Design a protein around this ligand. Structure first.
Ligand SMILES: *[C@@H]1O[C@H](CO)[C@@H](O[C@@H]2O[C@H](CO)[C@@H](O)[C@H](O)[C@H]2NC(C)=O)[C@H](O)[C@H]1NC(C)=O
Ligand SMILES: *[C@@H]1O[C@H](CO)[C@@H](O)[C@H](O)[C@H]1NC(C)=O
Lengths: 49, 44
């Protein structure tokens, strides 16, 4: 909004919990890297472990 | 050679030492080679 009408755009892609640990990033490596992401944000302050 | 020596020496301590992961999808081990192969001598 405050950066005007530059040709770049911003798209969001978020996923949810997985109980198993390898299948956390197993989805990430073919979802977000295929989406050409620049930054990944992890925001989970409750964990069962 | 180091893995076979450590497993052969660990088998004398306990029989069912070799245990693996059940499934990648969807009893944590306590007697592994992480605390056992501190010394080893393979082929001198
Ligand atoms: C963000 O970019 C992608 C471009 O396709 C779109 O979102 C995902 O697209 C992939 C395929 O590449 C699908 O597997 C996902 O299911 C899509 N997610 C969503 C939320 O649709 C989407 O066109 C763009 N914008 C949005 C709405 O996320
Ligand atoms: C390794 O350490 C043990 C400790 O009891 C010792 O008995 C043994 O001679 C040593 N040598 C090897 C490589 O087994």
């Amino acid at each position: 909004k405050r950066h005007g009408s530059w040709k770049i755009q911003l798209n969001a892609t978020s996923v949810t919990h997985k109980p198993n640990a390898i299948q956390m990033a197993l989805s990430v490596c073919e979802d977000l890297i295929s989406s050409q992401v620049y930054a990944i944000l992890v925001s989970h302050p409750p964990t069962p472990n | 050679g180091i893995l076979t020596t450590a497993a052969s020496s660990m088998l004398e301590k306990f029989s069912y030492i070799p245990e693996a992961k059940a499934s990648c999808y969807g009893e944590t081990p306590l007697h592994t080679l992480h605390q056992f192969m501190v010394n080893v001598t393979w082929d001198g």
